[PDB]
Amino acid sequence: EIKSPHEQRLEDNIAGKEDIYRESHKRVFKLLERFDGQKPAIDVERALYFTQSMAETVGQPLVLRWAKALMNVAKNITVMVQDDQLLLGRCGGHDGRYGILYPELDGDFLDIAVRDLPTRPQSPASISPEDAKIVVEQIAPFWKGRTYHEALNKALPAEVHKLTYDDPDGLISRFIVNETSSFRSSIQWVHDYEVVLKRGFNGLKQEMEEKLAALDPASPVDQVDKRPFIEATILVCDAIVLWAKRHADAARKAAEACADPVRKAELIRMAENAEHVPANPARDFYEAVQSQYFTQMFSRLEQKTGTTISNGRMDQYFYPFYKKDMEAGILTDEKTLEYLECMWVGMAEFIDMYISPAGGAFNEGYAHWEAVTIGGQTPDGRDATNDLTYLFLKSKREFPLHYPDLAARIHSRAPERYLWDVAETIKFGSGFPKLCNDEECIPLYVSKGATFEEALDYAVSGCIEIRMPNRDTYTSGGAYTNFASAVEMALYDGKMKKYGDVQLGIQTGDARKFKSWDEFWNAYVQQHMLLLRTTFIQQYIVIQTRAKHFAQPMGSVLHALCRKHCIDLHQPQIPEGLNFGYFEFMGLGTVIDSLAAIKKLVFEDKKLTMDQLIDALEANFEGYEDIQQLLRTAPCYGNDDEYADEIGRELDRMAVSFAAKYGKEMGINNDARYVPFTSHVPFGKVVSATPNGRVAWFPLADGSSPSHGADHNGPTAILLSNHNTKNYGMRARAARLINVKFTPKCVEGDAGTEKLVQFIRTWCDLKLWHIQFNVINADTLKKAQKDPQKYRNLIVRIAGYSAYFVDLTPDLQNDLIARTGHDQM
C-alpha cells in the first residue's frame, strides 16, 4: 500500500530524479557515484610485499616477521590522494572498489581464485592479467605447503575431516561441521582506538621502548619470548607512522600541482593531519577521524579480521573532540557529517574478499560487518546518548550506501527520544540500525569474569558480538554446525543424500522402521551429540594450529594486556585475559519444525507413516504435494506454541549444557551462538527435503528466526518463542540473530513508530540479544528479482548487514522473499 522512504528513493532514482539528500551531502555523493555497484577488483600489492618479506624471515619469531613484513608493505604499497576526499588511507593501488589478498591464510586457494573469482556466483571479483601473473608467479609459489588452511587440512583426524571437507585438500567444504578459521585470519575484533587518539603510536612506542630497556639481558625468557614481541610492536609503530607520512608527502605533491585554491587548502590540511596523527594524540575532531581512519585501514593490511575490523563506540570516543570543536566554533554538524561520511565512502571502497568457495558462500553480496556502536551506557553506568549519537542516525538515514554497519545499544533506561529516533531510522527501510541488548550480554559477561566498568563500555563487533578491547583475548574462528544435517542423518542412518553412501554420522538405523517417537528422538540425539563432539574437537585443533600461523603486532600493541605480558593476541592463553569463543547452531527453526512435524503427525496423531514421510522426502515432494501440505500443519517455532518451543528449548539445552562442560578444558568460553552470516544458504544446499515441508537444497531458517512462512501468530510471538527456547539458568550461550520483516503500512505514521518502540522495549525486557528489521513490501523484491538492472540500488537487511538485493544468489533472494512480512502488530 504505502512505500518506505527507501522504496520512494528507489523510485526517484529509477525515474531519473536527483536524490532528495544529494544537495546537503554533495561531496560524498560525488565520491560514491564513482564506484557505486562496480564489480570490485583484486589488488595484489599487500600480499606481494608481505610475501617478499616473509620469504626472507622464515624461522624467526612469527610476531617479529609480521612487523618486518608490514614495514615492507608500508614502504612500498601505493599511496594515493583521491579527488574530493578529505581523508588519506587506502589498502590498494586500484581506484574504486577493491579487495586484497592474504596468502598466509588461504594461499592454497590462489590458483582457484584466479580462474573462478570473476564468474563466481557469490560476490565475484575481477583480476587483470597483470595482477594474475604477479599472483601465480610471485605470491603463490612461496606459500605452497605454508598456508594455515593446508596446516588445518592435514591436522584434522579422519572422522573430523569427513565432516569438515569433501576433498582431501580441503578445497571444498561439506557444510556439516564447517570450520571458519580458513577464510578469515581471526574472528571479529575492535581496537582500542581511544588509546591512539589520546597517546598516539609515538606514546605506545615509548611505553614499549621502556619495556625493551627493562629486560634482563641474561634471562632466556626475556630475550627469547619477550624481546621479539617488544621489537615487533616498536617496529610496527614506526611502520604505520611511515605509512601516514607517505600519505602526507603525497598530499603535498598533490597540493603543488593543484590550481584550485580551495582544494589546495584542503590538501595542505590533509598533509598536516597525516604528519601529526596517528603518531601523536589528536588535537581536533578532524584529526581524530583521520587518526582512527589510519588505524583501521592499516589493520586491514595487518590481517583479514573476521567481518572486517570493527570500529567501537565512535559516538563516545569522538565526543570530547566534537564538543570542544563545536563550542570553539571551528566545527558544525554539517562539517561533522562530511568528515564521518568521507570515512564511510573510504570503507565502502574496501571490499573484504573471500577467495575460497566456502568463504564466498558465507558472505554473499560483498558482506561486511565493520560494526559502529552508538548509544548504550557509560563506563560509570549512566545513559550515554549524546549529540553525536543522533548525528550517526541522521547520517545513516541520508547517506545512501549500506555503510556503516550501524549498531544501536539498548538498555532498560534508554531515553524515549533515543528510541524514537532509532525507530524512525528503522522505518526508513534499509535495515539500520541493528539493536544490541545491554540487559542480556552485560550480566552474562560480568558472570564470565568481566568487571562492570569493562562490560558497560562494550563495543559491538562483527554481526552482533561484543568486545572489551583491553580484556578480550580470544581470536580463533569457530565451527559452524549444521544441525539440520543431524535431522537428515537421523532419517537415513547417518547418511546424507548429497554425499551418497559416505558414512557421515552414527548408524541409527533406517527411520522407516522406527516404531515410536522415543526411537526417532534417540536417533537425532545421537547425531546431535556427534556434531557437538566433532565441533569441539575441531575447535581445539584450530586453537592450536592458529597459534603457529597468525600474529598481530599492531593489534597487540593496542591491547593493554598484550603490552603488559608481551604476548601476541593470536596465542591461545594471555594472562588476565578473557576468552569468548563460539560455535554456531545452524538451522534452529528448520530442526524444531522438522522434529515437531514427526512427533505430532506421525506418532501422536498418526496422520501419516514414516514410509509416507520418507517417500515424500526422497521424491522432493514431487507427486507428494499432499504430504508436504500436511507437514505444514504441525506446530512451528515462532508462534508462542509451547508444543514446538519445548523441543527447541531442549535442543538449546543440549548445546548449552555441552558448551558449559567442555569449553573450560580448552581454556575458553566456547558458547552456543545462533548467528548465521549467509551460511544458511550453503548449509541448506547440502540438506535434502526436510520433515517441515522445506524442499531440497533450499536455505535453512536464518539465525534464530522462524522458518520461512511458519509464523502465523504475529511478530510479538517471535519474541516469545525466542525467549521460550532459551535456558537462562545456564550461561554457556552467546548472541542469537533475529530477523523480523514489517510492511511499511504495519508501522505507518506516529502511531506505527510508537508500536515499534514498545516492540523494542518488549524485546529488551525479554533479554533477547539482538533484533533487526526489514520495512518493505513483498512486491518490491519480486520486481527486483525479475528486472534486477532497473532495481540495482535496492538494499535489504540480510544477516547482521545490508546489501544490494541484485548481488544475491537466487537461493538467498528466495530466503529474503519467503520471510514473513507482517502487516499488523
Residue numbers in the entry: 6 to 830
Give the published text.
Here, we present a 2.7 Å resolution X-ray structure of wild-type IslA from Bilophila wadsworthia with isethionate bound. After dialysis of the purified protein and increasing the isethionate concentration, a second IslA structure with the substrate Ise bound was obtained. In the active site of the second IslA structure, electron density was observed for the substrate Ise. A Glu residue (Glu470) hydrogen bonds with the hydroxyl group of Ise with an additional hydrogen bond being provided by the amide of Cys468. Several polar and electrostatic residues stabilize the negatively charged sulfonate group of Ise: Arg189 and Gln193 of β1, as well as Arg678 of β8, all of which are conserved in IslA homologs but not in other GREs according to sequence alignments performed using Clustal Omega. A water molecule that is present in all four molecules of the asymmetric unit provides another hydrogen bonding partner to the sulfonate group. Specificity in GREs is thus determined both by the substitution of residues on similarly positioned parts of β strands and by the active site alterations created by β strands repositioning. The biggest rearrangement of a β strand in IslA is found in β6, which allows Ise to bind in a much higher up position in the active site than those of Hyp or choline in their respective enzymes (see above). To secure Ise in this “higher” substrate-binding position, Arg678 extends into the active site from a position on β8 too distant to interact with substrate in CutC and HypD. Another difference generated by the unique Ise positioning is that the pro-R hydrogen of C2, rather than the pro-S hydrogen, is closer to the thiol of Cys468, with distances of 2.6 and 4.2 Å, respectively. Attempts to re-position Ise such that the pro-S hydrogen of C2 is closer to Cys468 result in a poor fit to the electron density.
